[PDB]
Design a protein around this nucleic acid. Structure first.
Ligand SMILES: [Mg+2]
Ligand SMILES: [Mg+2]
Ligand SMILES: [Mg+2]
Ligand SMILES: [Mg+2]
Ligand SMILES: [Mg+2]
Ligand SMILES: [Mg+2]
Ligand SMILES: [Mg+2]
Ligand SMILES: [Mg+2]
Ligand SMILES: [Mg+2]
Lengths: 150, 117, 51
RNA sequence: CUUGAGUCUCGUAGAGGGGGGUAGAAUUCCAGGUGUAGCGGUGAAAUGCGUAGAGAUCUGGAGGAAUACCGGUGGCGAAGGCGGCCCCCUGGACGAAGACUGACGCUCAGGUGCGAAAGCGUGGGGAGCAAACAGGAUUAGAUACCCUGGUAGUCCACGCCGUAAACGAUGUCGACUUGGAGGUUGUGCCCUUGAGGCGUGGCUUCCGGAGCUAACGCGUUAAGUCGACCGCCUGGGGAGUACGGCCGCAAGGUUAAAACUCAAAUGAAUUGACGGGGGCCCGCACAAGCGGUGGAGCAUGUGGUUUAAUUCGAUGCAACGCGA
């Protein structure tokens, strides 16, 4: 409300040193088990970076580039009616949502081990193939379909 | 077909719907399009965007008539009252005149009561 | 309310309608009427117009 | 006798009244052209209108009703009320110079006349709107609000009905009592060089002093200070009802009680509370997120049921791993 927090500075990626990558590990992290998280992020970040051949953060970026929404609808209760109005998503949010979607979808990929799942979803994303990108499509389709209010 | 190259564009910006009709300077309608008919219904059909998709949708019909330039006849409030025009021109149309043929009686018939909540 | 404006230039000059017909009058006659409501509700605009 | 009242002359403004014309904008309806799958409507919808071609669009025609803009803190009228323009018949008001009659005045029970809308009778008219009525929707229901239709009526002539929060909720006529700002209409005077400035009558807004007032407020257009005449009130309910009279085509109007019953009914102002009133703010209140409950097995408390007893207490949030 009146408050004005902001962006809680996150500790840079250890094996690398990228703030973005760092928060990506937290999103996947669970029960405050930060170690277990990294043990999964890298293992899958490697099995993929290998195939792509290019540096992790590149294949990583590309993957996100697809699962990157530009606009989304924001609920608004104005006039005894909840009108769904779309709006361009800020830069920071874009990366966040993407990462969140990637994991949330990767976690439920029915594979064998989280690592493998993550690796796959991360790939499929880099070419609108997995569920991550799917979300963005449904979200982006939400907008425009409400562009009237936009 | 006839190649008119220049006619008029009537716009019915009704409070609920928005239809755009293109016809030669005679009156003979060459082709028409409507908001409600262009997809979205009820609530969304009576929005500014609605009329837009309609206007362009109309041109995709009368443009085959070799229409180049054309005037603009508008009447009625509601959205798409102005919108329709833009999409009409932007769609590649040499616009010229724009007049509001909105009917305004110097006190004649008694309007309906209605709306009471 | 006519608008020909020679010479090409994507400017509507719509402001014209907004200085006569269109709403205000159209929106006025839209629904029901008044019959007595004006001599009061409308003549109450002065009780405010005073200041 | 002339200052009250009236008369005459000359102007001034006006939606004042009666009658008759007439113009333009729009709606609807009819006919034809172009054109094609929707239109219309709502919160959504649906009824409805559409391929028998609607809607939109253009042309031609018919008809009724009402007169955007001007237009207003505006004007006229006794009140009701009266708005396009033109003609004819007509009423009132105001000023100005003056001229004339010479108290001819003010008020008025009864009486007479005028009276919004709705309503009634006869004969017309009927576009739009709309009691009734019929569908559709909404809801627990919805004999409503909303939607689609739609008769009376709304319009006209003549007659009847006489009521309204017919209100300024404030009777008419007259004389006095500090001010300010403004509208409207007439008029005398001044280089009006230009509008303008000095004023002086009529009508009319807003603020406000004294004083008046229970207060709110009124305040030279008084609800102030006085005079002439009139109408009316005497607790709430019952009841503007019954009965009777008069009036009315009727609907009903007008005149107007009692029995019984209550200790109040009521006006204004005050504080607070509340409002599906307004403004401005706070809180994991929401929104943004993470993880849960509600399903599962079990633990536990409660209600319930049972029991000879299932000891008593806690029960919206603020009771239910609570007193234990
Ligand atoms: Mg109705
Ligand atoms: Mg009548
Ligand atoms: Mg009759
Ligand atoms: Mg007067
Ligand atoms: Mg005062
Ligand atoms: Mg009270
Ligand atoms: Mg906190
Ligand atoms: Mg939340
Ligand atoms: Mg959840």
């Amino acid at each position: 409300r009146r408050r004005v927090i902001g962006q809680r500075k996150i500790l840079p990626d250890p094996k690398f040193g990228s703030e973005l990558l760092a928060k990506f590990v937290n999103i996947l992290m669970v029960d405050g088990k930060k170690s277990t998280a990294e043990s999964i992020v890298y293992s899958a970040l490697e099995t993929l970076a290998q195939r792509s051949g290019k540096s992790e953060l590149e294949a990583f970026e590309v993957a996100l580039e697809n699962v990157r929404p530009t606009v989304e609808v924001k609920s608004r209760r104005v006039g005894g009616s909840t009108y769904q109005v779309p709006v361009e998503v800020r830069p920071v949010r874009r990366n966040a949502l993407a990462m969140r979607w990637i994991v949330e979808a990767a976690r439920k990929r029915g594979d064998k081990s989280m690592a493998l799942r993550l690796a796959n979803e991360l790939s499929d994303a880099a070419e609108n193939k997995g569920t991550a990108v799917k979300k963005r499509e449904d979200v982006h389709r939400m907008a425009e379909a409400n562009k009237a209010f936009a | 077909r006839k190649q008119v190259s220049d006619g008029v564009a009537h716009i019915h910006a009704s409070f609920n719907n928005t239809i755009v009709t293109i016809t030669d300077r005679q009156g003979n309608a060459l082709g028409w399009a409507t908001a409600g008919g262009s997809g979205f219904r009820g609530s969304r059909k009576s929005t500014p965007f609605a009329a837009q998709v309609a206007a362009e949708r109309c041109a995709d019909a009368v443009k085959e008539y070799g229409i180049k330039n054309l005037e603009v006849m508008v009447k009625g409030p509601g959205p798409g009252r102005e919108s329709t025009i833009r999409a009409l021109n932007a769609a590649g149309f040499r616009i010229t005149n724009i007049t509001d043929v909105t009917p305004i009686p110097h006190n004649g018939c008694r309007p309906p009561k209605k709306r009471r909540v | 309310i006519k608008v020909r404006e020679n010479e090409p230039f994507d400017v509507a000059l719509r402001r014209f309608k907004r200085s006569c017909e269109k709403a205000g009058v159209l929106a006025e006659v839209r629904r029901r009427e008044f019959y007595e409501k004006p001599t009061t509700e409308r003549k109450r605009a002065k009780a405010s117009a005073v200041k």
